[PDB]
Amino acid sequence: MPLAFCGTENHSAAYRVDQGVLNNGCFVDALNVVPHVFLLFITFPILFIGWGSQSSKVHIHHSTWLHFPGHNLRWILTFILLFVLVCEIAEGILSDGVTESRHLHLYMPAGMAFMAAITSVVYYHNIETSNFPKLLIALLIYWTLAFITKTIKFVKFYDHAIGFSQLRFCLTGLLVILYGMLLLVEVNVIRVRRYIFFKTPREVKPPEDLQDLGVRFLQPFVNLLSKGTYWWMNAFIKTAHKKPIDLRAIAKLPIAMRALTNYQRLCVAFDAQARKDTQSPQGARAIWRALCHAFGRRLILSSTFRILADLLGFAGPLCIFGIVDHLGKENHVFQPKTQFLGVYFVSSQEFLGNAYVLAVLLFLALLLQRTFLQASYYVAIETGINLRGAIQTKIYNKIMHMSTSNLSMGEMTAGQICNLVAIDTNQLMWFFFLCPNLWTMPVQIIVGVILLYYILGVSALIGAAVIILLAPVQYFVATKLSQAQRTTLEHSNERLKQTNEMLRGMKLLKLYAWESIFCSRVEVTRRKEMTSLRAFAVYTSISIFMNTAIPIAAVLITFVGHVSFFKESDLSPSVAFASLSLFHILVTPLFLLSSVVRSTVKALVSVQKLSEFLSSAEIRECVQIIGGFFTWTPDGIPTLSNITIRIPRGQLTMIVGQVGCGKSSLLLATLGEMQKVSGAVFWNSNRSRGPVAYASQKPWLLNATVEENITFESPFNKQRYKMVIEACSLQPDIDILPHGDQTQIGERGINLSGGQRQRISVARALYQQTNVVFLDDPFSALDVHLSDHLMQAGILELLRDDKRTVVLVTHKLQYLPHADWIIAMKDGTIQREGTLKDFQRSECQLFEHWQRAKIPWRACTKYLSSAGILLLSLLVFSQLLKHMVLVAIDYWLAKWTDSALVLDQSVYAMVFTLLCSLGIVLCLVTSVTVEWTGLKVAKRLHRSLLNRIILAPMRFFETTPLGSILNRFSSDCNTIDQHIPSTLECLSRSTLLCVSALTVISYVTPVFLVALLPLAVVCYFIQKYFRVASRDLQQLDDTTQLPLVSHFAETVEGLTTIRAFRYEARFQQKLLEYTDSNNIASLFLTAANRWLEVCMEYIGACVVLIAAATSISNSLHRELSAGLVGLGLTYALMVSNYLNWMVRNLADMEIQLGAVKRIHALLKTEAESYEGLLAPSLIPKNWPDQGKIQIQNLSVRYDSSLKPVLKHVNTLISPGQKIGICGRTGSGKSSFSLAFFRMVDMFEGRIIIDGIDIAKLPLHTLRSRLSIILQDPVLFSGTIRFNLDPEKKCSDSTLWEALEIAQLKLVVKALPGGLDAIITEGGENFSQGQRQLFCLARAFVRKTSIFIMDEATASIDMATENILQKVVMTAFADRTVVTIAHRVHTILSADLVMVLKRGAILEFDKPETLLSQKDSVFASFV
């Protein structure tokens, strides 16, 4: 009885070749073996020679691809003929398993056809990579050969009169037209590329996007299986573990996603609509129609994949119902009825009612659901990202035409348009991510409600009414959540600005011993934010609570209704577990549908925002102006008219005019940026415009290097840059910043001063090599007179050797009647534009003669010092107890259904209610404990970060910038307050559900764990490589969308400078490079996420296959009783999207715990301990009023490394002798001024204080009674009485003495509040003398005898005189001073003085006149 091919019954009577050769029903299957082994045995030498040549030379293996025409339908026909060949294997096994013999002619041809079709697509792939089309002649003669043999078999089935009743007739007719239809695909290749029989072949090249050198993101040009399963990602993602992902390692990007290309497509759509339609604006509906018209051809494709993914989703619970129903009722028949020609044909009802066949059908349904779902995700993502590209370029195109009016720009500042780019366009992008959901998620829910009613009955409609009343509850909780988050975040903005004003003036607040009191003024605002954050935690626990206790209450209400209330159709375990798995596939879209509805409302609001922006007023469509009309409102009232002035080439026009008489309007009207109503503009550079150089009254600099704001995207030569840096006095300006030509100048970088920024803008105007140069008052704020004179003489000299026009419009009348062709604007009109002698004839000259490590160190430190074990134990215990209860509620359903099908039943229902009650109660406990632990976490970490940043030396603030401390304060507190606890609840639910699910799978099938261990290893490595790639692409996402919104700020601010140069096109390309570097980082983050999700979900599909096969096998024989088996299969389906969530939430927890690692690292910088090593009240007096601090040889250092400065200075301040001691400003001025206050490391010597020990004094009390003034003053915002004395807050009459008799009386008494008004962020237009007024106020009120002074940086001469008069009052009232003043030409008035240059005792003059008589002290005074 050996392995016969045909039947071994009737003594080999099925081999009788009589009655025809083909009418023997086994010989036709013998024919079908022939073409498949023909292809294998003609394409094994081809494939192995090909595979060897890649093992010799594989460098060019990622170079150039060309798919043959008809490629996508080739692959989908191979997949669906693979599907039906698996079905004929299933039919063949189930038909031949009814007789005594083996009957191998039912599943030898189908099995070898399966391997032949797989090898016929590997051969096609190895011939599509290498353009050699004449070698797939073998494959087309295969398909015509295989089509003929199944044509033989099908027409003999019609002649043996099977008909469509038996199953293999239907399948064979289906796969006859399969091989026929892709044979027709093969002759399409013959027809198009014309290689076989045609005299001239058409030869195509690989496309230009592939042939470019660096393109890594090769997803739009790869075969269909690699688009489905992201196989190309592997060579990228495995590379990411050796070398990190630099921005050169990411792609350039393909042509289909370049920001210019999507912008072209979107502009074609807008132009086509506005021509054919009668819409006068391109308003809201116009933009809305245009986006759909340009991107519907992809968005419909994403929705198509999503609908197919939804239907193949419901072939999961349907397969559980079929499996468990057949696994009940004894497995009685297991044999086919039909017997045609002695062979048994399986009836199709017996086919799709079998156990293993329906299980393999379940497996193949999941490998198509969970691949079309991922293709649906990515196509929705990729079309959304191409909206980000085209809409940012569209917004920026209408930045390049926006007028700087008082109505267009006078309404919306650059903060509005930066928030427009960021918030608005991202939520419009998020609408096109969620766009297939509003087309499919209703079909998902509707087909879900319908077939859940067919499975169970009307009690399932009570259950479906519960979950369909869990979408509005999620919506209203999310609405209250967004309200609370709105109020909390715009409250903590005020807290972060207050912390910025308390951490910028670190030296000034530490000098008056005011780090503790200002920390309290921060802590009060923090606790108001903490109340708002507690409301955030309440409204986000209920989202967790509803997500994890609406389905349990739904299941409890469902089955208790069906048995107690209904008594209609008793379980039937198949009915119960099909209903459970349907509830999980319904619970996922429901909570997310609330977020979809939110995104739809925001999308409509967002296109409204972007429509009123896009259709606001534009600007418009040598020098000569005739008509003289120029306005800002686009009709009526010209703000500068009667302008009839001509300034041709070869000129340097100094201009003049009144204060606010239309000066900048006149210059900008020549610039063509004003809507000139009446008049013409003749224009010719030595009517179209040349690159007019310009520098506005308000300065402007790109947030870049100082040379980058000087050369301004132009070539760089050393000679002209050195001359412009010398003439504009820029070498002291470069040295004024600690890096010069590498420091990030301007805003977002090194904080400059007003004179410095005005001089930098003038430098960019001269260097840019232009046929005109406009200087709109450069010498207005720059009070350095000789700088302006050298600039004036140097501007004339530079342009005279260049022969190009200049125009300087200001009131600097020192040169205006001398050597210009001047023009004067009186009352907003032109009087005379001529020579200086004409102004000597119109009465106007009178005025000029008048690692890659991770969590567990940082996560342990986070959980310990933040939570506290009295709640850490409650959190971990409640999660584990809730999940044992969830295993119990599922297992109790299984045990009750087994004992109900084979028939204490009300006992089962009652204990089911008392297990569902524990489910809801434990989920509320876990939902409260996670968010409450996170709330307490943020409280103690914020007080620790504030106190350790307070209890720090000022030397640390010299080392690290204010940018680093403010960033890891504000943004990282946000991450550890509102993002880590929600991620913690999601992570502690996701990994615990996975351990729960695999314990249950291993419990039902103890064969699984042997097949789990290699599967868990593969799951572990996929997890490992994804973390390495996802972290690096995440930082590459963040640090690339930052410079782009930086660009949108820096463009809208200095708009008129860019349109002046006609250098708009270079900034257009800078955006497009930034947008390409953003979209390629965003697309790699998307495609790496999909590679994880496809690969981990296939691992989940293999879980389903192994679990279902071993469970049914152990329930046919070992009698599992099928209650457990349904409980097995309904968790095998849920594994596939718990491994996904475990790995993704672990990656998000990684990046977010990295923002608590940095806060602990910055808590690790502690110094300046308040060490009073005596009896701390006996060492000082009540207040030191001697002023007799004899400094004794106090030698200074900071790091104590290589160079002390102060040496042997045995110098005393006598009581009364207000010793103004100036020295060398290069070495010993600023260092000594800081170290005088015990704010530096005096490593030796003796620093006395009135003869007492100032090394063991209370440093709070020591820094209390010794006042100071500063060089660059700043006012901490608050009350004016808080600006005078926050630690005291003594009385108003002390403030009356202060704010009258010191200074500023006609500002304080003329203020609206007085001493109790809010200092509006520093006193933005108060004075510079308020610094000295606050100095004298704090010197008389805080018992301050000493007053250590520094010089004014920028002040008025009368303000310096008023400071001198207040200094006379300071000696008369405080009697102790030791002053150093960098304004050296005025610092001679003292009693005794010492000039101590380069760290020595070099000059001493106890009378003041002896310094001016001697040699060395006079030379520093000459």
Partner 1 sequence: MLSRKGIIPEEYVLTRLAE
Ligand X SMILES: Nc1ncnc2c1ncn2[C@@H]1O[C@H](COP(=O)(O)OP(=O)(O)OP(=O)(O)O)[C@@H](O)[C@H]1O
Question: According to the annotation, is 1141 in a ligand binding site?
Answer: no
CB 1138 within 8 A of CB 1166: no
Residue among 663, 764, 883, 1366 that touches ligand X (CB under 6 A): 663
User: Is the CB of 485 or the CB of 1386 nearer to partner 1?
Assistant: 485
Distance CA 699, CA 615 (A): 29
In this chain, which stretch among 30-38, 411-419, 550-558, 584-592 interacts with ligand GBM, using CB under 6 A? Answer: 584-592
Residue 404 vs 1068, nearer CB to ligand X = 404
CA torsion, ordered 306, 312, 317, 322, to nearest 10 deg: 170
Binding status of residue 675 toward ligand X by CB under 6 A: no
Note whether 1102 and 1145 are within 8 A (CB): no
Smallest distance, partner 1 to C-beta of residue 756, A? 19
Q: Which of 521, 598, 939, 1382 binds partner 1 (CB under 8 A)?
A: 598
1115 is in an annotated binding site: no
Q: Is residue 1092 within the footprint of ligand GBM (CB under 6 A)?
A: no
Binding residue (CB under 8 A) for partner 1 from 684, 944, 970, 1279: 970
Q: How far apart are CA 651 and CA 823, in angstroms?
A: 13
Provide CB contacts within 8 A for 300, sequence distance 6+.
none
Rounded Cα distance between 993 and 996, Å, is 5
The helix/strand/coil state of 1354 is coil
Q: How many CA atoms does the CB half-sphere of 112 hold within 13 Å?
A: 19
* The one segment of 723-731, 781-789, 881-889, 978-986 that binds partner 1 by CB under 8 A: 978-986
Task: Tell whether residue 1229 is among the known ligand binding residues.
Answer: yes
Residue 970 binding result from partner 1, ligand GBM, ligand X, none, given CB thresholds of 5 to 8 Å by partner type: partner 1
CA distance 631 to 679: 12
Please report whether residue 1039 would count as binding ligand GBM according to CB under 6 A.
no
State the alpha helices, DSSP H only, in 902-979. Answer: 905-950, 954-959, 962-978
Nearest Cα neighbor of 64 from 221, 248, 231 is: 221
381 binds ligand GBM (CB under 6 A): yes
How far is 473 from 481, CA to CA, in rounded Å?
12
The phi and psi torsions of 1196 (rounded to 5 degrees) equal -105, 155
Evaluate the omega torsion of the peptide bond into residue 572 and state whether it is cis, within 30 degrees of 0: yes
Residues 6+ apart with CB under 8 A from 1392: 1214, 1217, 1219, 1221, 1404, 1405, 1406, 1407, 1408
The response to whether 459 counts as a known ligand-binding position is no
Binding status of residue 749 toward partner 1 by CB under 8 A:
yes
For residue 632, the partner it binds in ligand GBM, ligand X, partner 1, none, with Cβ less than 5 to 8 A by kind, is ligand X
Contact call for residue 430 and partner 1 (CB under 8 A) = yes
Q: How far is the CB of 501 from ligand X (least distance, A)?
A: 28
For the chain, the 3-state helix, strand and coil shares in percent, each to the nearest 5, are 60, 5, 35
**Under rule CB under 6 A, residue 697 binds ligand X:** yes
Look at strands 681-682 and 623-625 and give their pairing: antiparallel
C-alpha to C-alpha distance for 1319 and 1308, rounded to whole angstroms = 12
Residue 662 partner contact from ligand GBM, ligand X, partner 1, none using kind-dependent CB cut-offs of 5 to 8 Å = ligand X
Residue 354: strand, helix, or coil: coil
Residue 641 beta carbon to ligand X: minimum distance, rounded to whole angstroms: 11
- Give the residue, chosen from 1042, 1161, 1173, 1419, that forms a contact with partner 1 under the rule CB under 8 A: 1042
Taking the least distance from each CB to partner 1, the nearer of 549 and 645 is 549
CB-based burial of residue 621 (10 Å sphere; 0-12 exposed, 13-18 middle, 19+ buried)?
Answer: exposed
Task: Using DSSP, state whether 1272 is helix, strand or coil.
Answer: coil
- Confirm or deny that 936 is annotated as ligand binding: no
Q: Which is nearer to ligand GBM, 427 or 1068 (CB)?
A: 427
Return the residues of window 440-479 that contact ligand GBM according to CB under 6 A.
Answer: 441
DSSP class of 421: I
Q: Using the rule CB under 6 A, which residue among 632, 767, 1347, 1421 binds ligand X?
A: 632
Treating both helix axes as pointing N-terminal to C-terminal, what angle do 1008-1053 and 1139-1163 enclose, rounded to 10 degrees?
A: 60
The response to whether 1293 counts as a known ligand-binding position is: no
Does the footprint of ligand X cover residue 660 (CB under 6 A)? yes
- CB 881, CB 556: distance < 8 Å: no
What type of residue is 118? I
Segment lying near ligand GBM (by CB under 6 A), choices 188-196, 374-382, 893-901, 1395-1403? 374-382
Q: Does 1228 appear as a known binding residue?
A: yes
Q: Is the dihedral of CA 994, 997, 1000, 1004 positive or negative?
A: negative
Shortest gap between Cβ of 971 and partner 1 (angstroms)? 6
Contact set for ligand X, span 861-900 (CB under 6 A):
none
Q: Does 636 bind ligand X (CB under 6 A)?
A: no
Strand ranges for 779-874 from DSSP E: 805-809, 823-826, 829-833
Least distance to ligand X, CB of residue 1051, Å: 17
Compare residues 431 and 774 and give the one whose CB is closer to ligand X: 774
User: Measured from the CB atom, is 257 or 544 closer to partner 1?
Assistant: 544
Coil, helix or strand for 654? Answer: strand
CB contact at 8 A, 830 and 644:
yes
Site string for partner 1, 1131-1150 (x = CB under 8 A): ----------x--xx--x--
Among 368, 434, 762, 1308, binds ligand GBM (CB under 6 A): 434
Considering Cα of 669, then 804, then 692, then 776, what sign does the dihedral take?
A: negative
H or E segment to which residue 226 belongs? helix 224-229
Stretch of 353-361, 965-973, 1300-1308, 1312-1320 lying at the interface with partner 1 (CB under 8 A): 965-973
Q: Does 648 bind partner 1 (CB under 8 A)?
A: no
C-alpha span between 782 and 780 (Å, rounded): 6
**Nearest distance in Å: CB 644, ligand X:** 17
Nearer to partner 1 (CB atom), residue 423 or residue 1318: 423
Is 697 marked as a binding-site residue?
A: yes
- Note whether 588 binds ligand GBM by CB under 6 A: yes
User: CB-based burial of residue 23 (10 Å sphere; 0-12 exposed, 13-18 middle, 19+ buried)?
Assistant: middle
Least distance (Å) between residue 659 CB and ligand X? 6
Instruction: Determine whether the annotation assigns residue 665 to a binding site.
Output: yes
**If we measure between CA atoms, which residue out of 1148, 1132, 1145, 1146 comes closest to residue 1099?**
1132
Dihedral of the alpha carbons of 875, 880, 885, 891, in degrees to the nearest 10: 160
Considering the rule CB under 8 A, would residue 982 count as an interface residue with partner 1?
A: yes
1038 binding partner 1? (CB under 8 A): yes
* Residue 1165 binding partner 1, by CB under 8 A: no
Q: Which stretch binds ligand GBM (CB under 6 A): 171-179, 432-440, 917-925, 1236-1244?
A: 432-440
Q: Residue 1201, annotated ligand binder?
A: no
Under the binding rule (CB under 8 A), the answer on residue 1018 touching partner 1 is no
Q: Which does 380 bind (CB under 5 to 8 A by kind): ligand X, partner 1, ligand GBM, none?
A: ligand GBM
Can residue 388 be called a binding residue for ligand X (CB under 6 A)?
Answer: no
Give the residues lining the site for partner 1 (CB under 8 A). Answer: 419, 422-423, 426-427, 430, 485-486, 489-490, 493, 496, 547-548, 592, 595, 598-599, 748-749, 961-964, 966-967, 970-971, 982-983, 986, 989-990, 993, 1038, 1042, 1045, 1141, 1144-1145, 1148
Binding site for ligand GBM (CB under 6 A): 377, 380-381, 433-434, 437, 441, 588-589, 592, 1037, 1082, 1085-1086, 1089
- Residues belonging to the binding site for ADP are 1225-1226, 1228-1231
Q: Please state the residue numbers annotated as binding site for ATP.
A: 632, 660, 664-665, 1327
Given the rule CB under 6 A, which residues bind ligand X? 404, 406, 632, 639, 659-665, 697, 777
